[PDB]
Amino acid sequence: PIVRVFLPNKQRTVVPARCGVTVRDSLKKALMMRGLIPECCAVYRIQEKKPIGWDTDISWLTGEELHVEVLENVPLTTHNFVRKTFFTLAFCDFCRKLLFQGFRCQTCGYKFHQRCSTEVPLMCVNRDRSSSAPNVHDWEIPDGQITVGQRIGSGSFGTVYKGKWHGDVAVKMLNVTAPTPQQLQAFKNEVGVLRKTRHVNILLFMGYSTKPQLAIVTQWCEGSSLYHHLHIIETKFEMIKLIDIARQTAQGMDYLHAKSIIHRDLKSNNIFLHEDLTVKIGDFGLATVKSRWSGSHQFEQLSGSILWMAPEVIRMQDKNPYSFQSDVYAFGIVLYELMTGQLPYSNINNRDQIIFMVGRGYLSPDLSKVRSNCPKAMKRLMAECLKKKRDERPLFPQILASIELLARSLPKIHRSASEPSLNRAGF
Amino acid sequence: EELELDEQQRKRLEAFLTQKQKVGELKDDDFEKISELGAGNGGVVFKVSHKPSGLVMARKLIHLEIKPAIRNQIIRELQVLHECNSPYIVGFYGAFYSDGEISICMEHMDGGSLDQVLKKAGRIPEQILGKVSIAVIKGLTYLREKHKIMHRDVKPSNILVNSRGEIKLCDFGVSGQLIDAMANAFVGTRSYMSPERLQGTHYSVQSDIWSMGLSLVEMAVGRYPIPPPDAKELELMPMAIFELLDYIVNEPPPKLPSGVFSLEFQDFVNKCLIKNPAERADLKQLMVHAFIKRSDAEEVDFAGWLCSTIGLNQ
Amino acid sequence: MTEYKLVVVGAGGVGKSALTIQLIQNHFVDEYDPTIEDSYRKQVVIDGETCLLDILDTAGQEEYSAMRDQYMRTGEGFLCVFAINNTKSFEDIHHYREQIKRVKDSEDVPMVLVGNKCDLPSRTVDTKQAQDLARSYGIPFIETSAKTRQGVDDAFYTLVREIRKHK
Amino acid sequence: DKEELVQRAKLAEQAERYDDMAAAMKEVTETGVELSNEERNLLSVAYKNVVGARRSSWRVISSIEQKTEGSERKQQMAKEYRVKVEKELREICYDVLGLLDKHLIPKASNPESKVFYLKMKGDYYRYLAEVATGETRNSVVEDSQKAYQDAFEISKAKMQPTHPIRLGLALNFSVFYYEILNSPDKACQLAKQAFDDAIAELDTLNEDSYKDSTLIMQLLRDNLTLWTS
Amino acid sequence: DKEELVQRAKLAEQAERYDDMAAAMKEVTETGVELSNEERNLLSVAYKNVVGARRSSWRVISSIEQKTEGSERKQQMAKEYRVKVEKELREICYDVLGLLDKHLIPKASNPESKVFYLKMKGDYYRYLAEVATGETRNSVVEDSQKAYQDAFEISKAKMQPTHPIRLGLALNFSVFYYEILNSPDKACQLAKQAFDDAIAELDTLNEDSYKDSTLIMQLLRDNLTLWTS
Ligand SMILES: Nc1nc2c(ncn2[C@@H]2O[C@H](COP(=O)(O)OP(=O)(O)NP(=O)(O)O)[C@@H](O)[C@H]2O)c(=O)[nH]1
Ligand SMILES: Nc1ncnc2c1ncn2[C@@H]1O[C@H](COP(=O)(O)OP(=O)(O)OP(O)(O)=S)[C@@H](O)[C@H]1O
Ligand SMILES: Nc1ncnc2c1ncn2[C@@H]1O[C@H](COP(=O)(O)OP(=O)(O)OP(O)(O)=S)[C@@H](O)[C@H]1O
Ligand SMILES: O=C(NOCCO)c1ccc2cncn2c1Nc1ccc(I)cc1F
Ligand SMILES: [Mg+2]
Ligand SMILES: [Mg+2]
Ligand SMILES: [Zn+2]
Ligand SMILES: [Zn+2]
């Protein structure tokens, strides 16, 4: 008289069917061997699955097949909550609105409103008053003026030639050969959108030309890319310098989103470190030259690199996968690259496998390779930026604000922790 | 010898070795580009000639920004090719680094890759296909014995031929560091990796066998087998990449249509496309396959047929 | 990350289950509860790699060899266990190796020879016999005691290393 | 030299010591010289911090008072604490109003500074009223009405429908309406009109003020959505 | 009477207003009535809030002091402000220290209360030494070491090593060693020993003492991780 038992984690065992012996006593040894306890698990019999008591005699179950499923009764969990009110710009992590009076975790810095308490994640993973007024603190250059420069490199959709037009200018030779009239019109519209733009941290857009094939003319930049300094010379950066770079990079993304233009291609190659101090970004927008047209349509064709692509843009089940969340995810990968100094997925050499495992959600960037001097708040920010779902990702105003807060909080957090406070919360 | 090489193959190998002995150091200024042979996924191939010797060779340039240490490591790893000598491998001359570019000097092949031949021919006769498979198996065996290296990138684009009918392989993964470097370069349209290797489990040449079988099927049908032809698509005798990968992982593999292909060939491709890599036969078991025996028994004037199909005058 | 399927085989009573339970839970079972089938999972770092071990502990009683054969077919490497006080269990290592060859349809299967119960007095299978048998198959020999835990990790970790070599 | 006081207040800002900052800026106000655009922000923020802290204290005390509903003198003690903090808040607001009406209102060369000062006056009257109860509440409500009307007229006349000051003034006026007059219809109408005006010039967003304007607009949308009920 | 003071202190803590609560607890302990652990926890938290805020302010001010050197004589007035802040800190520190000798240390009825008071004395000695210099700092740190050793000996001889209070005492002692003796080796060894002792005594505590231990152990792991380099 024996009973065959199926166990979680695709395991199994057989126990004898002795009279006077319960199922719980029979399987206690197996559960202890497998780090489980009967009280936190359920037992079912095949008859399709019928739950039975743990105290049931195994003798009456002779010849039967049993299955064990783990229960869930005590999530428990907690954070160290201290009441506090922020006098600068801040937002609830859950409710995404302005935050004047609420609660704060001393552990990780999670902030939420009084009314948002029941929605806070359980695991410390590392008639109301209205709001108020918070504190305050046709442009084609004619031919004969473009100096055909020297070939430099070829990217996802273009080629680089540094020419002369009233000084050094950057010219990108597009890989598109035959633009459709509708495609040409849309290209002109987007160029006109870009022309009336100007910012300290965005490269100037300087028109275009169409006589010598079709190419884009932009302001040339001196120096080198971020990707070079992170992985060519392997020059390390200090916390102040690194967070400053991140803050500057985020500064321009808010501007671009304010003018309602999706970057779609923020990879570490596309960030310049001009004059060794100022972050400048180029090579953005241009929806026309990507997703090669089959006619009067531009059905989405994937192109470029895959490390900085978000899961949804890979999945391609959405009509307009390139949304603000794509730029958010790109910024997350950029933060990770700056913080670790190692490219993501450094243990997989098959790009097909990388694509597949990103698409099914099975693989995410490492979170243990971070250094041991980065404050936990930046880790929380980085973790939040890389969420699989696109709905819960933050938008760039919030990330800019949190970066600003953690930056101004820098001088006091360098030293080690001291004595922590007690619970000081009511639940 | 020490191998099963006839007089012709041995003599041609000796001649190529003698030609290599006439080639010394390689530099950028030592070669002049004659024509472009095609652009790769992250590079391009140019027909070049070594002016100090006048020999016309094939040169592939790879653009990948890496640190000098990795460059020198790849240079050291590339030196193994000198001891590699087999009729089934594209001849090489050498490689060097210059101008932030990776250049490799290899034997120029006038026959071109199988992709252009298939494009200009539509479909390939089974007799022609059978001859290539045995040479592929022998080359894979040579690589696995002499160097224990799995190609991992077996596809029609990596097979070159000549007007003489000889078949050789290339683009093998000899340098693992270079393999890792090219991993994060750009994106492709269609792939051929085995479903198990997508799961992080290594089974060496089983994936190569699986990829070879699918490549042979595609060359036989004149269409990418994924997705399988539907009704009128099969009667003719823009899918997303993620869709293709998921379909490959979670669908039964396709098969040759009945009647138009010999049952031995259908059994061979079924064995070569077993979903379980463990159940898939190895090179030894595939060698003793009845279809392979028939192919060996058969004799085909492949060189003349290829010249006629391309249009070359003998 | 890396999963290894390990099968423990050998004659009844040699200590297959006691060895497995020492690996999984660091506890020695002194009772003799004959196995019909038992499988376990254990995550362990071996040579710097985080390994998921599936341990398939089989019946020594030949009455249940059909179940044993189903476990063997899924396995990647085999611990072939005898007891140092049971000469027939030692002689029957040949039987178990032949079973592995039959079920795996291969003569090239990772295997480690384990001589268990080395804490006992009056040992009757000597070191020279055991090392000669392991040598005859080209496999490692590990002495173990499930009671003292001597050799337990070495036996399983060596098998993992043999599987890696074979891959 | 007032610049020394300016630097002192700037240091105190990051020092998070707001009482000393308030006193230092009050000294500069007492100097009786016309202020710059920059210093006005510091003054407003400095007083706003203290007023907001006191407001939060009053809110939590009132919430506790509504919560207890017992029979004990703890409620009386809490009410005494509430009246004490209300008294000190009244003193602070009176000081701010006096300084404003004696130095800033009399000397307003540029209309924008006048609009800002009137907005401050109205918001501080609202701060008074939210604890005020009785005839004095009605009087300060009327004074806030006058200030808001005066500011709104000049804003509609000589201020773009995109500049942040006008947006904040509209927000404050809407809040004052919704809280004091409890007239959601007109407040919603004003909010919709202001949002439409802002959307009209959705392009004219220069480097100087891009995030603040859109942040205010988002807050307006949120309040309108909340008021839809 | 005293219960009314307790309610007042709880209300103040809820409203985050601290100085009034500090004075209330000071008079509560000056009354000389029996003091329980729950009551003194409120006093400790109250003093901790203000002292930590002012410590942060001093740290920021000192950072700004050395932020710029080749400039005008504004660093001079900045350091004058810093000295004023330091004097303010010294006054409250002296009051706190004298409070122990007045009521806490003499009215010592239970060993864990003595451990708690000595730990507080050492912590505030370290706080003073943060700004103290020279012979005064040396004397203060010697006094801190004396209290540290006395508290640790009693903790070792009397109660279990798995209680959170002992863990906090060890952590603070290690931090003091790092910040004064600057001996990473001795402090690291002591921290590792304490962590191992805590790990040995696991799964043997009460329902209430299941969360404090987690935070303390996490902090210990963080300190060891940072100090390993
Ligand atoms: N002294 C000693 N006894 C051991 C050792 N290993 C196992 N035993 C004892 O030998 C008996 C059989 O052990 P067990 O692990 O059940 O053997 P098994 O090979 O799994 N038997 P089966 O094939 O029936 O499943 C038990 O009484 C066990 O305590 C050992 O190393 N030393
Ligand atoms: N404004 C610029 N000034 C200087 N160099 C530039 C400028 N824009 C592009 N480049 C160079 O262009 C090279 C390759 O072209 P890019 O398209 O910028 O790179 P890329 O990232 O491969 O292309 P994409 O579309 O961004 S993926 C880079 O390595 C830069 O050195
Ligand atoms: N040995 C060769 N002899 C003659 N032509 C060759 C040879 N190798 C490559 N070519 C040609 O050059 C082109 C570019 O080389 P490839 O590296 O094969 O490009 P590719 O096919 O895009 O790269 P993959 O990785 O194989 S898809 C090929 O498509 C052929 O037309
Ligand atoms: O060429 C390659 N991939 O294709 C490029 C995209 O078309 C390739 C790919 C991997 C690799 C590892 N070590 C060398 N490797 C290559 N080089 C190579 C190998 C053999 C010959 I013979 C000539 C060669 F250039
Ligand atoms: Mg190729
Ligand atoms: Mg057993
Ligand atoms: Zn938390
Ligand atoms: Zn919220």
Same domain, B234 and B176: yes
C167 at B interface, C-beta within 8 A: yes
B1 lies in a domain?
A: no
| Gap from CA of A393 to ligand 8 centroid (Å) | 15
Is C in contact with A (3 or more beta carbon pairs below 8 Å)?
Answer: yes
Output the six-digit token pair for C115: 């001589």
**Contact (CB<8Å) C167/B200:** no
Question: Which chains lie within 8 Å of chain B at 3 or more CB pairs, if any?
Answer: A, C
Same domain, B153 and B260: yes
Q: Give the active site residues of B.
A: 153
Fold (topology level) of A2-70: Ubiquitin-like (UB roll) (3.10.20)
Give strand pairing partners of A103.
A83, A112
| Gap from CA of D1 to ligand 1 centroid (Å) | 93
Residue B77's domain is classified under what CATH number?
Answer: 3.30.200.20
Is C in contact with B (3 or more beta carbon pairs below 8 Å)?
Answer: yes
Rg of chain E (C-alpha set): 19
Give strand pairing partners of C79.
C8, C112
| Gap from CA of A155 to ligand 2 centroid (Å) | 7
Measured in angstroms, the resolution is 4.3
Nearest alpha carbon to residue A12 among A40, A39, A46, A53: A46
The total number of structural domains in chain B stands at 2
| Gap from CA of B312 to ligand 5 centroid (Å) | 24
Does B171 sit in the ligand 4 pocket, CB within 6 Å? yes
**Can you tell me which residue has the tokens 């008591």?**
A53
Is E in contact with D (3 or more beta carbon pairs below 8 Å)?
Answer: yes
**Can you tell me which residue has the tokens 């007891």?**
C83
CA B7 to mean position of chain CA atoms: 25
Q: Look at chain B and count its residues.
A: 314
CB neighbour burial string for A117-149, b if at least 16 within 10 angstroms, e if fewer: eeebeeebebeeeebbbbbeeeeebeeeebeeb
Question: Which chains lie within 8 Å of chain C at 3 or more CB pairs, if any?
Answer: A, B
Give all domains of chain D, ordered by start, each with its CATH number. Answer: 1-229 (1.20.190.20)
**Can you tell me which residue has the tokens 């990948």?**
B64
Using CA atoms, how far apart are residues A105 and A107, in angstroms rounded to an integer?
Answer: 5
Contact between residue B114 and residue B129 where contact means Cβ atoms under 8 Å apart: no
**Contact (CB<8Å) C41/A34:** yes
Using CA atoms, how far apart are residues D1 and A62, in angstroms rounded to an integer?
Answer: 97
E226 at A interface, C-beta within 8 A: yes
Output the six-digit token pair for C111: 């295997």
Residues of A in contact with E222 (CB under 8 A): 416-417
Residues of A in contact with E45 (CB under 8 A): 421-422, 424
Does B23 sit in the ligand 4 pocket, CB within 6 Å? no
CB pairs under 8 A between A and C: 31
| C-alpha distances in Å from residue A171, one per residue of A215, D28, D112 | 7, 54, 45
Strand pairing report for C2-10 and C77-83: parallel
Which of helix, strand or coil describes residue A425?
A: coil
CA D159 to mean position of chain CA atoms: 19
B204 at C interface, C-beta within 8 A: yes
> What's the first-to-final CA gap in chain E, in angstroms?
54
Q: The dihedral of CA A345, A347, A352, A354: what is its sign?
A: negative
Question: Which chains lie within 8 Å of chain E at 3 or more CB pairs, if any?
Answer: A, D
Residue B116 is labelled as binding a ligand = yes
Give strand pairing partners of B49.
B32, B56
Residues of A in contact with E209 (CB under 8 A): none
Residue D23: HSE in the Cβ half-sphere, 13 Å Cα cutoff: 4
User: Is CATH 3.30.60.20 correct for A81-119?
Assistant: yes
Among B106, B133, B162, the domain-final residue is B106
CA B160 to mean position of chain CA atoms: 7
Nearest alpha carbon to residue A93 among A73, A107, A72, A113: A113
Looking at residue E179, the DSSP 8-state letter turns out to be: I
Nearest to C41 among A4, A9, A32 (CB): A9
Using CA atoms, how far apart are residues A271 and B50, in angstroms rounded to an integer?
Answer: 40
Q: Obtained via which technique? A: cryo-EM
Residue B80: HSE in the Cβ half-sphere, 13 Å Cα cutoff: 14
Using CB atoms within 10 Å of the CB of residue B82, give its burial: 0 to 12 exposed, 13 to 18 middle, 19+ buried: exposed
Residues of D in contact with E11 (CB under 8 A): 61, 64, 77-78, 81
Ordered alpha helix ranges (H), chain C? 16-25, 65-74, 87-91, 93-104, 127-137, 152-166
| C-alpha distances in Å from residue B196, one per residue of A86, A315, B200 | 53, 21, 7
B2 lies in a domain?
A: no
Residue B141's domain is classified under what CATH number?
Answer: 1.10.510.10
C165 at B interface, C-beta within 8 A: no
Probe site for chain A from B189, B193, B245, B247 (most A CB atoms < 10 A): B245
- Binding residue ranges of A for Zn(2+): 79, 92, 95, 105, 108, 113, 116, 124
DSSP assignment of E5-16: HHHHHHHHHHTT
Which of helix, strand or coil describes residue E119?
A: helix
Q: Read off the amino acid at residue E131.
A: V
Same domain, B82 and B164: no
Strand ranges, E, within chain C: 2-10, 37-46, 49-58, 77-83, 111-116, 141-143
Same domain, B146 and B240: yes
**Contact (CB<8Å) B202/C1:** no
**CATH class of residue range C2-166:** alpha beta
Using CA atoms, how far apart are residues A326 and A315, in angstroms rounded to an integer?
Answer: 12
Q: Read off the amino acid at residue D171.
A: L
Among B58, B84, B106, the domain-final residue is B106
Which residues, other chains included, contact E111 with Cβ-Cβ below 8 Å and sequence gap of 6+? E154, E158, E159
Residues of A in contact with E223 (CB under 8 A): 416-417
Contact between residue E68 and residue E75 where contact means Cβ atoms under 8 Å apart: yes
Nearest alpha carbon to residue A207 among A196, A160, A266, A290: A196
Using CA atoms, how far apart are residues B203 and B201, in angstroms rounded to an integer?
Answer: 7
Using CA atoms, how far apart are residues A249 and D53, in angstroms rounded to an integer?
Answer: 34
Contact between residue C163 and residue C134 where contact means Cβ atoms under 8 Å apart: no
Residue A217: HSE in the Cβ half-sphere, 13 Å Cα cutoff: 26
| Domain boundary assignment for chain C | 2-166
D62 at A interface, C-beta within 8 A: no
Among B80, B106, B132, the domain-final residue is B106
Does B140 sit in the ligand 3 pocket, CB within 6 Å? no
| Domain boundary assignment for chain A | 2-70, 81-119
Using CA atoms, how far apart are residues C83 and C123, in angstroms rounded to an integer?
Answer: 9
Using CB atoms within 10 Å of the CB of residue E3, give its burial: 0 to 12 exposed, 13 to 18 middle, 19+ buried: exposed
A353 at B interface, C-beta within 8 A: yes
Same domain, B88 and B132: no
Using CA atoms, how far apart are residues A310 and A332, in angstroms rounded to an integer?
Answer: 10
B187 lies in a domain?
A: yes
Q: How far apart are the CA of C103 and the nearest CA of chain A, in angstroms? A: 21
Residue B64's domain comprises: 7-106
Output the six-digit token pair for A233: 């010379």
Residue A223: HSE in the Cβ half-sphere, 13 Å Cα cutoff: 18
Q: How far apart are the CA of A150 and the nearest CA of chain E, in angstroms? A: 45
Q: Where is A174: in which H helix or E strand?
A: strand A168-174
Q: Look at chain D and count its residues.
A: 229
Q: Which residue out of B36, B104, B113, B118 has the highest number of ligand 3 atoms within 8 Å of its CB and is therefore the one to mutate?
A: B113
E63 at D interface, C-beta within 8 A: no
Does B92 sit in the ligand 4 pocket, CB within 6 Å? yes
Tell me whether residue A265 is one of the annotated catalytic residues: yes
